Design a protein around this ligand. Sequence first.
Ligand SMILES: *[C@@H]1O[C@H](CO)[C@@H](O[C@@H]2O[C@H](CO)[C@@H](O)[C@H](O)[C@H]2NC(C)=O)[C@H](O)[C@H]1NC(C)=O
Ligand SMILES: *[C@@H]1O[C@H](CO)[C@@H](O[C@@H]2O[C@H](CO)[C@@H](O)[C@H](O)[C@H]2NC(C)=O)[C@H](O)[C@H]1NC(C)=O
Ligand SMILES: *[C@@H]1O[C@H](CO)[C@@H](O[C@@H]2O[C@H](CO)[C@@H](O)[C@H](O)[C@H]2NC(C)=O)[C@H](O)[C@H]1NC(C)=O
Lengths: 167, 167, 167, 321, 321, 321
Amino acid sequence: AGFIEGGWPGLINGWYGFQHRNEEGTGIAADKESTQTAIDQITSKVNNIVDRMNTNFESVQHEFSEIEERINQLSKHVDDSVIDIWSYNAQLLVLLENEKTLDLHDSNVRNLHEKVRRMLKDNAKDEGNGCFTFYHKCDNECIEKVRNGTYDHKEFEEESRLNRQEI
Amino acid sequence: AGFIEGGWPGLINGWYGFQHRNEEGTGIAADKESTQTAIDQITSKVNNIVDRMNTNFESVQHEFSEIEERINQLSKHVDDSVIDIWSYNAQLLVLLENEKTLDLHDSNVRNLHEKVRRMLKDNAKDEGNGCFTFYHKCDNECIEKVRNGTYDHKEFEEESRLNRQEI
Amino acid sequence: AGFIEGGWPGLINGWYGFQHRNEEGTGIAADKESTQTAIDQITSKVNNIVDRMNTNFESVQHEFSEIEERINQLSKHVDDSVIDIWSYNAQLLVLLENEKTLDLHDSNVRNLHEKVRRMLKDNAKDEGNGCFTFYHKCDNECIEKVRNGTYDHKEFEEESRLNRQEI
Amino acid sequence: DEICIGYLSNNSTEKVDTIIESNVTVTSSVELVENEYTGSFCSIDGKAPISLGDCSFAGWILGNPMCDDLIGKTSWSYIVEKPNPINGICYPGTLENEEELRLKFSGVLEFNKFEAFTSNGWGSVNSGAGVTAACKFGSSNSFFRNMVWLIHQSGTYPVIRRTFNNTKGRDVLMVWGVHHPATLKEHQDLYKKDNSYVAVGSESYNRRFTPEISTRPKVNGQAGRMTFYWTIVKPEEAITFESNGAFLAPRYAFELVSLGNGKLFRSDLNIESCSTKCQSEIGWINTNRSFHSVHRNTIGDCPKYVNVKSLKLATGLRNVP
Amino acid sequence: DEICIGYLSNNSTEKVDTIIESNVTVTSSVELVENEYTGSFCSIDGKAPISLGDCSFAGWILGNPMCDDLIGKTSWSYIVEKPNPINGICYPGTLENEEELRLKFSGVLEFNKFEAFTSNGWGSVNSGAGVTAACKFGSSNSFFRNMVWLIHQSGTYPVIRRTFNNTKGRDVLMVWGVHHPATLKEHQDLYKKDNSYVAVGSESYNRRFTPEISTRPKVNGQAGRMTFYWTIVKPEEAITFESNGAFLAPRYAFELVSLGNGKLFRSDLNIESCSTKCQSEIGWINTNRSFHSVHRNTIGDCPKYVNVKSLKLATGLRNVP
Amino acid sequence: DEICIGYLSNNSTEKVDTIIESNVTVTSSVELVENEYTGSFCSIDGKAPISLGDCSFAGWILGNPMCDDLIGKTSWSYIVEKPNPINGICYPGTLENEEELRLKFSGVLEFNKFEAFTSNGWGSVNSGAGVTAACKFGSSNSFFRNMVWLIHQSGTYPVIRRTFNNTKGRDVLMVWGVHHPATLKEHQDLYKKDNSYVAVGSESYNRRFTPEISTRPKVNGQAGRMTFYWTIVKPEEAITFESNGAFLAPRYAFELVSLGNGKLFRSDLNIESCSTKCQSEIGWINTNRSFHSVHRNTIGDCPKYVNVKSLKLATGLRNVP
Ligand SMILES: *[C@@H]1O[C@H](CO)[C@@H](O[C@@H]2O[C@H](CO)[C@@H](O)[C@H](O)[C@H]2NC(C)=O)[C@H](O)[C@H]1NC(C)=O
Ligand SMILES: *[C@@H]1O[C@H](CO)[C@@H](O[C@@H]2O[C@H](CO)[C@@H](O)[C@H](O)[C@H]2NC(C)=O)[C@H](O)[C@H]1NC(C)=O
Ligand SMILES: *[C@@H]1O[C@H](CO)[C@@H](O[C@@H]2O[C@H](CO)[C@@H](O)[C@H](O)[C@H]2NC(C)=O)[C@H](O)[C@H]1NC(C)=O
């Protein structure tokens, strides 16, 4: 079950990670590093929208007599149209940044998928559904090396070429 | 003749589709589903820009005497700079959303290309030009299954492996 | 040493290019065409932000008596909030277009990498690090044909298939 | 045997712009902005506007005597005044706060003109002479119909005082004036005494006014001036006018019957019998589009005015054979 | 043996929008806008506001005699007036530029009321009667406390003149008035002469005022009016009042002690003993969020008001099992 | 044998921001905003501005007698006044609508001063005394040069009357005043009668002014005041001045010759002989950039002012060895 067929209820401590099946059993485990980066980025996005790019504007309304109706209507028109402007700016920025947030998550998961394909090189078949059948036994020591990005493809290069050759 | 080399005068009822050549001849046919999704999305984009994200502003211009020139200049300055603001907002939004529309179409066609690559798996050579030489006879019944996404790669897996092995 | 592992101090006359190693030696050379296009695009982006999308607003401040404090405070509130609005608009547009500039460069380099993969077709192994081991001798006449996009894959098709078959 | 993935290429010659690229041909694009308008005044929801004919706003409100075509034009979607109306404040003068009253009438859609004070009911004073060559009716000497220019009866002008008790349950617009004679003599011959006052007072209004005598140049043959004033008498308010001269006494007043979104256009253009969702100072706009750049001065259900003459918004693909 | 790459799917039912897609369920989203508020007036950083109780701004500044609960309310974070207070300018009239003075007091946070002119020190003139049924204290006839209504002593009202030397090193707000009697007789009985003046002059101020005698409709039983004036005496300015009648003479003035960002709310809501970072015209807002849509009329450290009731901002992923 | 595809890495230390990342080093970036300025007043397209030297706007328009350096400063790109000039309305007073006249002069680029009424042509009246310690020339008693303070000849001040026929085909700015003496005696000694008038009438103007006699606190040793009026006499208008006293009679007037976009800066900075495309209240700006944050109060062909001191716009790539 990979990322093309959907998300995982059961990814506990993160937004992106890996599901494996080996001989010692099955596991789901979050990717600490690609998750934290996404969180720093979305924390930047929120903090930019609610403060720093949230330039402050407070309504100043005065009183006017019955023959100051021109200045009354003008002062109220200033207040109304400037609220309308900050209100467009907030709704638009949210709408444009919502599209970008959704594209960032999509784009972050597909970057892990390719950081892992490049580590795995000739030792795993890309099943296309966002998975990898290895060409060698990948025990829990091997899996944790794929997860923490210490997987050297030379350690399993010959074993892989031999199992693959025979297919 | 694929999508990398350009678009198809002759794609009749759609924005994205398939050209095939088999033994029974050649054909162009629009992709109903990926086209309608793009249309719902662009219809959302237009409807958002011309209404809902088109917050309304009407000019309030009053008359002034020759010794109300300060108040005249101020009322006209409010009207001018607020029109200038809504006018920037519309032109900018169009400019930014034009870039995004063009990138969405480009990105939608490359998603069809990859939804088809994942169905086809090891049964077709990715020619690079956005096409696929199959490794088996794909009669009109086989093509229509690629188009409507019911193409099971097992039905032609052995035939394909046998023709490919021999190359 | 490819683009996945980072940029090249030593790319002289460009933003994107090619590093080669053959039998005659080693070289870095910028890509004239993909660099100029990126420059036309960024020049359009700057020229749009500083002029044309830089709709003009000049402050009007007049003088008021001690019993014209309402109109004084209103004229100054209009000036303050409209500068605030053009100031948000400039900083936001820069922030959103900075993100897009960085993504354009990333996206331009990966398009060269794929325009070259499609030219090279079956004659080079995609090493995954943004490089290509050829399956034939690629002399400086062959390299310059890869760089200027005139590399016909038929010229080296048999030699390549023969060296690759034997692996 | 092969299958390719593709997109649309097109007849289309239509270009759009982005921040990185200009004049990019695309398979389809909409123009968002509307630029055509017709150039007459139509009705808004089948309610016709009124022409002030050949009167200024001021001439209409004060009842310039040549502005009788206007009686019974009592409701409107909006008002059209011409840029140079011929019949203004004929007796040379000013209407105080004419511009504040012009804004009020942007909000007024129907009034009803009535007699608040009988011309004849002021006490011992001549309601009858009170006419001038400045304010002609036909070719004959008249005066503003909404006020009466009181002078001495039998060689004396007493202190006159009358009250209007507003029992209409609605805002009544009342108008009056002060005469600024050219010489003490013109003051004496009209108000058979040397110096006068006009005193106007309600539960919320309060003013004394006095003539200001001086030699001006003539305008419409008159060295005198008149300043015309207005106020809104709210329902249940009484308003008392007291005076011993230089008084242009109120006669007709206006019950403000319907309020709503109105306008006053200044233009040459003709009122035709058509409807429009949207009416601008230079003509009517009939569009399905949500932006226009015809003219900012608009009334009805209207597109957003913008500076920009064109917004080409891309719908389709880049388009390349 | 195999490894897949994936993302989170969720119980989450929360939807957000983009320009191309509405009601898109996502794994998490924040609401940026705040809409809950409490509906009383609290203190801003522990500084309480003041209620004007049952007085208008004007009644408070002039010292309407039924506004004594207000004496010694001398500092505030802001001021609450009720929309239709019962105790205004009891003797019917107006405070000139009341709106400009209202704005001043948006910027004032503390004043100190003092006696600028002794009630008794105006000369041969009665400081002692100067009371009316319009301006009751209990059931007993009174007058605005901040001014004194001088009349004749023993059948004569002399020319009275006093000066205030502003030695406070701060802006002093001074108020006075002019009486507009209903009849010459009321003028004669009070100011034992036919016509009076009030002359007020400083290094920067200069005005003569005169009664305007005329019968207005009665308000609080009075056909007469009064017009009340104010000015700021700047530090080291001297201001002279000269008059021979119709003079509501200054007594108490206000030293403008602390300036700062204040407000005047018009509302029926109650001042409670609580604190708030943020106070709106219709209640207090207690939020960690940076946008709100409670009410635009706000004081304290406040979120940006916006028209929009909700901005759902996506944090999480698209969420699809 | 192999070929790689690559991008630029750089010495560059320059950082920019996005919504998702701060302080991102890049291969190149431009600064859009300009912050350097020089701090004098230059000419705009070789047209010099003028200093009012040590005069208020008012002192300059009325011709304060110590403002003679200003005669023949008749055209400008803009005007520089010092924030507290020493030479104002020396005889203490006010210029009515001084602020609206200040706005007029924001629109005026050249005037032409001319004698509209000879000082000596007013009739049996002393044009010759009309000088005071308030309005010193050197160490000697003078008066505003643009008006003349007329007094009795041989114990009589007749009713004087003169007309100015504006035949210049352009707007003429006229100034005059009314004397508000401190005592009846000062009135008697100067205008040999108890009470005077000043009457000013044109086709459009109409005012009678009267002295208002009272002791104000002394300013420049004067208990009296003067109120100075201005009006625009439009082409073909005749304006008549009639008076029997308290009259500061018009002498010099200003033909408003060139209109255009001007300014009035208040600052102590000096006019130097340089050119600038752009001039701000605190100095000149010489930049090819399209935003600046020097000061909002700007004249000439100028960049858009913004609050933000820096906009770092990325041109290059992310830059990573
Ligand atoms: C897109 O193309 C048109 C046509 O070539 C541009 O408008 C013209 O600009 C030229 C000079 O460049 C002027 O002298 C013409 O009078 C214009 N012609 C028309 C018919 O408009 C237009 O500005 C281009 N867009 C951009 C962004 O450069
Ligand atoms: C998002 O979904 C909600 C609820 O499913 C939509 O709100 C409804 O809108 C329809 C009309 O199209 C109304 O009949 C209902 O009264 C609304 N329901 C509720 C519970 O408020 C909402 O319009 C959708 N948003 C968009 C942009 O389509
Ligand atoms: C980007 O870089 C600068 C330089 O390090 C940061 O400015 C510093 O901010 C800290 C606290 O955040 C201040 O106390 C320092 O005094 C600042 N240093 C200098 C040299 O000015 C800036 O805050 C960074 N921007 C972001 C968005 O993180």
